[PDB]
Amino acid sequence: GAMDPDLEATLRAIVHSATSLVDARYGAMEVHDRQHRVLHFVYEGIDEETVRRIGHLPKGLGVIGLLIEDPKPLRLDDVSAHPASIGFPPYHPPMRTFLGVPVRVRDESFGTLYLTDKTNGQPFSDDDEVLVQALAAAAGIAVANARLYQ
Amino acid sequence: PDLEATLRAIVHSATSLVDARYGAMEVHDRQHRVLHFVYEGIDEETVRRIGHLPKGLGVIGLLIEDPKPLRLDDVSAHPASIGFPPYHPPMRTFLGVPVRVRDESFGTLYLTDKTNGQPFSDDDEVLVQALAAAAGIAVANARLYQ
Ligand code: HEM
Ligand code: HEM
Ligand SMILES: [Ca+2]
């Protein structure tokens, strides 16, 4: 089923603010179930034709998986060089710099929020990490309270 | 609290990320009585001096009547401005947005006095709207629970 419309609008707004404020080329959020299964995927920075070419949606594998087992921020300067990296699928844009955080309320996990390819070729900053943590915390509030509502 | 802690956390994110001196959120019922008023940036002694809680008048009243973002270089210069009560800190720059869901608006999240005298930006407005939207879902759920 589709996400609740208020939740969807809120999460897209959060992904947009995060992407815009950290000057990332790409931004995404996975919304999960209680067993960390991806239920919804919202993103920005990739055109419709490229989305069609890629075809299958992400399973939340690789480095994204680390945000769950180690629920703290992860910054990398060459994401697909990490040993946990599963690699990009055919037609997916290549990406290098990465900033990811879990979306949580207290210890409860609701998904992941991540950004790639800071526009200046630079690594994501400490300030970028703090901003993205705060926005992920808001996303957690949104998911937790939409769920309860539904 | 539950809700109150949530709203305080959202006010803290808005105020700290935009780098404003003061931040607040008012949540009202359908007859505009204040149900929650949470804020940061003002010391307890000054709070005691102001005395009474805001009623949601002036520029905040405007935001309740017509819920859409309002950014001002000088809040006291707006035609709807009612002025501050005695002992309230002086405040100049202003950004306020509604706390809502599609069905209903519940409150207003607002910031004043961005650091270094600067006006709030379009980026600040967009960020505060995203934070407000999360608070809007929390308020909507609290009204089901209550
Ligand atoms: C636009 C924002 C996006 C960002 C920031 C992003 C980021 C990433 C990153 C960093 C990886 C590699 C993880 C690793 O190697 O461990 C990855 C993999 C992957 N991406 Fe994306 N991606 C985006 C959009 C998309 C879209 C729109 C699709 C599908 C239409 C997609 C499908 C996939 C798939 C299938 C994988 C393989 C791993 C998995 O299934 O989880 N991505 N993505
Ligand atoms: C620290 C965060 C705060 C912010 C950002 C803030 C901001 C404002 C603003 C923008 C106005 C509008 C004045 C106008 O229309 O010209 C106002 C008025 C007012 N404020 Fe505050 N304020 C804060 C804290 C407080 C506190 C702690 C109190 C008392 C406990 C208070 C009591 C009032 C009252 C009584 C008014 C008159 C209008 C009304 O009743 O709504 N304020 N404030
Ligand atoms: Ca550092």
Domain locations in chain B as residue ranges: 1-146
Instruction: Test B141 with A149 for CB contact under 8 angstroms.
Output: yes
Both structure tokens of A63: 């480095």
C-alpha A12/C-alpha A5 separation (Å) is 11
Q: Which residues form the pocket of ligand 1, taking CB atoms under 6 Å from any ligand atom?
A: A 26-28, 43, 45-46, 51, 54, 56-64, 79-80, 85-89, 92, 95, 98, 114, 116
Specify the amino acid at residue B102. R
The structure's method of determination equals X-ray
Select from B10, B131, B139, B146 the residue whose CB has the most chain A CBs within 10 Å, as the one to mutate to test that interface.
B131
Select from A145, A147, A148 the residue whose CB has the most chain B CBs within 10 Å, as the one to mutate to test that interface.
A145
Contact A146, B101 (CB under 8 A): no
Both structure tokens of B84: 């501050």
Task: Give CA angle at B132 (A126, B36), nearest 5°.
Answer: 115
The CATH number of B1-146 is which of 1.10.10.10, 3.40.50.720, 3.40.50.300, 3.30.450.40? 3.30.450.40
Q: Give distance in angstroms: CA of A58 to centre of ligand 1.
A: 6
3-state SS record for B40-67: ECCCHHHHHHHCCCCCCCHHHHHHHHCC
**What is residue B115's three-state secondary structure?**
helix
The angle that helices B3-18 and B122-145 make with each other, rounded to 10 degrees, is 180
- Beta strand residue intervals within B29-146, DSSP E: 34-40, 70-72, 94-101, 104-114
Cβ neighbours of A94 (radius 10 Å): 9
DSSP-assigned letters across all residues of A23-83: TEEEEEEEEE-TT--EEEEEEES--HHHHHHH-SPP-S-THHHHHHHS-S-EEESSGGGST
The CATH number of A1-150 is which of 1.20.1290.10, 3.90.550.10, 3.30.450.40, 3.40.1670.10? 3.30.450.40
Specify the amino acid at residue A20. S
DSSP B73: S
Dihedral angle computed from the Cα positions of residues A67, A72, A77 and A80, in that order, rounded to the nearest 10 degrees: -10
The angle that helices A126-149 and B3-18 make with each other, rounded to 10 degrees, is 150
In 3D space, the residue among B71, B59, B129, B121 whose CA is nearest the CA of residue B100 turns out to be B129
C-alpha B114/C-alpha B110 separation (Å) is 11
Helix (H) or strand (E) holding B146: none
Task: Give CA angle at A66 (A26, A21), nearest 5°.
Answer: 30
C-alpha A131/C-alpha B66 separation (Å) is 30
- Phi first, then psi: give them for residue B96, nearest 5 degrees: -135, 145
Q: Give distance in angstroms: CA of B35 to centre of ligand 1.
A: 43
Residue of A17, A141, A146 lying closest to B6 (CB–CB): A141
B96 lines ligand 2 (CB under 6 A): no
C-alpha A12/C-alpha A73 separation (Å) is 20
Helix (H) or strand (E) holding B13: helix B3-18
Both structure tokens of A50: 């490229």
Instruction: Test B127 with A6 for CB contact under 8 angstroms.
Output: no
C-alpha B98/C-alpha B38 separation (Å) is 15
